Design a binder for these strands. Sequence first.
DNA 1: TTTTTTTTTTT
Lengths: 589, 589
Amino acid sequence: QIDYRDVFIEFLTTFKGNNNQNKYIERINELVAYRKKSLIIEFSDVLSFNENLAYEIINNTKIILPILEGALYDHILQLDPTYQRDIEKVHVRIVGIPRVIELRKIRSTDIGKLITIDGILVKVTPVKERIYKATYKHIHPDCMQEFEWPEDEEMPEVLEMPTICPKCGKPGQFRLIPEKTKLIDWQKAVIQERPEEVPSGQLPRQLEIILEDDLVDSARPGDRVKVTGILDIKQDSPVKRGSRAVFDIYMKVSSIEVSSEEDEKKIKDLAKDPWIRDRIISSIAPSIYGHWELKEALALALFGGVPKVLEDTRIRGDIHILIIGDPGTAKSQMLQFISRVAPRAVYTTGKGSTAAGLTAAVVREKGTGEYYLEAGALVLADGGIAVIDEIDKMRDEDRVAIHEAMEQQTVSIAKAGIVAKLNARAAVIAAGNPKFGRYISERPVSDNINLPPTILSRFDLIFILKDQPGEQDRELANYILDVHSGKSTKNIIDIDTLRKYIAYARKYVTPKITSEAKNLITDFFVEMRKKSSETPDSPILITPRQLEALIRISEAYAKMALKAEVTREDAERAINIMRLFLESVGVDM
Amino acid sequence: QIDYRDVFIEFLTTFKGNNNQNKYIERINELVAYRKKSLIIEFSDVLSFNENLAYEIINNTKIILPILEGALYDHILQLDPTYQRDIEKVHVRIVGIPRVIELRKIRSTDIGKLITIDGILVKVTPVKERIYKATYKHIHPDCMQEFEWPEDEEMPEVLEMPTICPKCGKPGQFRLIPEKTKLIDWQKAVIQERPEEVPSGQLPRQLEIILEDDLVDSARPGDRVKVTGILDIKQDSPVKRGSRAVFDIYMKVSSIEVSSEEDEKKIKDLAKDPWIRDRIISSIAPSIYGHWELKEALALALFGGVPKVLEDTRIRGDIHILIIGDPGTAKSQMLQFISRVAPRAVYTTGKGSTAAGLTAAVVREKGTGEYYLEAGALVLADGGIAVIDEIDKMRDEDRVAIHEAMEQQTVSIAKAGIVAKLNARAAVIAAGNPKFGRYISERPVSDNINLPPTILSRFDLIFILKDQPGEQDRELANYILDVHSGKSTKNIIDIDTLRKYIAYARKYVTPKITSEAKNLITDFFVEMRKKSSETPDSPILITPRQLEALIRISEAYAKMALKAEVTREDAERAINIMRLFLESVGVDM
DNA sequence: TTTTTTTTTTT
Ligand SMILES: [Mg+2]
Ligand SMILES: [Mg+2]
Ligand SMILES: [Zn+2]
Ligand SMILES: [Zn+2]
């Protein structure tokens, strides 16, 4: 019953952070600068500053938030009077609630309590409007009266029309007045539980969440998010009894987090090492022995090149990798690692995917009856990585649907009266087997690969893996047994900080090409084309795409070291890795 | 008539177990300590204690369960006052009801009586909430009153709204208040009669069951269960009568069991025998003569290896077996035995299965038009064994769908805008025929097997069965005729005991590899690779998967004897069995 | 009719 409003202001005005800079007065300082009407607090900070204040938010969230928000609004107005007439209400969001419940473990006892759920966002609906205070007109020739229907209370989830006119006490028919109605932004989304917590032999469960006001459009499908709010039962058709007094539960979102300054200097410290490139390469798939050239190639695809956007056209900045090898060469294990270390990645297989599922699918809503598009794997992976294992198992009639997405990075649809064009700027990493399961050295490369030259030319690098039992078997056997015995390689960058390093590099680093790098690349390309003319039977063609592959690879190498320009050293590395690619496919220079 | 609360409390505090250790008091504090809020009792024990009490439970169940629930709650409160305010109700569940009725024999006379049904779980719905006590607000400008609608009575299965406001006596509008409404967990499941119970020439029947409160998520689809509760008629759509006074029936589950200390003593006693491994192998398919190496191989697949989960990757721990042989070599009979003895197994046929049905199917829900996922055979067999007979009859373009699930133990779907990943950690035992029905010795092994090298490398062991007539025919004929004569081989572990032994071993034994075993395994693998390179024509490739097969087989042998370490003896057995596999496919060692 | 995944008969 004690007044907590005064506790809030002294908390906000007076608080010391880890950096000792009064972190919580700059956020409100920027609150009026951009008029975002939303302030973020941490439960750990509120607990340390006042244990009693923290508890009251947890258990009395229903009837403490409007008072707490109202107190903050008065303080903001005192700081700057111009905030008036721009924002009517200011929301404060609480994160870090210790009450974390798994999606499958929610029971009846959790209804009406503030909880947190971690999951995957799978579906988002367009932003709509919800009525919380309506205005009606009594259509009865004596009344012609206006009145806000829900008195001293907001409109519930179910819309209800008055039966007795409050202005005359008589029944009749009432007409809604949209211009005098108060609205609020409304959005619906579906959260799916992570695959880690799914029990054996069961399908993942889903939960419906509601985003309102400024929380709309705060995430995209495929993101991993943490949502905090209040559970409630969902009402859809209360008018129809139809027996079955059984309801589904939904969650009203109060705050959402999508999966800091100390990381920046940690990343900067790593980039200062002259051998950072070797450290990153050694940190790719530590459980796999050997395959150094493959690990280097996979590292480049994670960073990628610099996309170019011009007045008349744009140039792809992503790097595509194709691996062909004998079974058991650990191709799939490295692809699994890539899908975990990448900040955004989608893992698909050749057999378990279709053309519609990879790019875009036309789905007809049975209720309304109209067609609309559904995002495929490549569209959802925009700005990230797409992994396509067992690419050779795809039907050739179905695999050609990704030809334009791999180069033009767009998906074109002309179906069921829908014409659209969606961006699919995603790097593609694929693996497969030769025509006869294992590579046959007694036959030409033409019949071993069994892939059209059109798709081969779209891959920046192609590595052919051969399982040759030699003198390294003992070393390979010892390494594998050490892994099975729990022994772990040391002096490597762990996956968590490695993911942060890649995300930072792809966002703030844009290398530039210098004059000396141009000459090295130009000379090498001429030799590549000249050497290719010697053997025209090979299904590997040296097209102008190969020249742009060198530019992208060179930029990727500089991006690993966080350099702002491409020097001759980065150009030399790009030539070296390209040379190994050519030797694998049988082109020797 | 009389009150049994004193007897019930006395029975719990005075009953004696098998060792007269009062097997019921130590369950009470376990209920208090974990707040499990559900206690079970045995009907045999109650009958053995007081016959009159058992009859009252078995007959007057609907008027004695609340009475015993209240008596139990009071005894808990005095034992521990902290139990209050956390659990407001504790249910007691009675099992072992003598009233057992087949699913097909249920008639109107059994309605309203406590019965028990044994069947197979097929469908489970997500957990929902059911209202048992509602709260309404009369929307009439004079009332603004809140009240609990169902007075001194639980809310029926049909949602009924008040017609006359009790607080004012007038009709009008009533608004539900979710905050004051009381809810209870609710789940719906479907149970099917056992295949051995279905009459000739008819499809199996199904029954709908309801699980509430703590009984939700008590089992997974495909389980074998025994459900006890009260039968009742189902009221689903009472809005319009439409004549048709005919109703279905459904079961309100009171206690459910799936498929102990005395068993543990029996299991541990078996492991003391030095020849337990030989004794176990002799118990595999006792009705099949010969095929000792096959029975040994099948025994290993039942136990499996030790899966390894690391911070960056995971390693398969399951063992896959492939059998190729001439027709009439008892391949199908042995596979049928594995289905019976395995704690969890799924039997499929190559011709009677599809790619979608084996892994996962995307189907369009008719009511809404939205696509959703259906679990395949491999997903349902997670943590168990998947049996695929006539694998050679599968279409090659369709058989490749299981390549991912056999090594990475995952199922990936990218179809119709659905991207998902599912766990399929199951062991695969497959059988089939050579290319020409019977094995042809003139032709090489490559054209006889007629399988791609990719699928072959996935199998830990491959055995080729040749039906060669010889001097052993007389022994085989005598053995078969004795089986038809009713004679049974003795000194073999019965199937029920063997199933318990395997389940215990797979749950509590995690063998570790010693230094001595590492040296033996490494030497053999190096030797295998050298021999393979000498004859680069066989369809079997010695990939690094073969090295991991040796580790998995070694752990299985140790796990068979409930050993915590892999000594050198287990390594020699693993090497020896692999030698027989290599000689079967014509690879000399 | 229309796109989609699926098992099925029949174009
Ligand atoms: Mg693979
Ligand atoms: Mg057979
Ligand atoms: Zn009026
Ligand atoms: Zn009233």
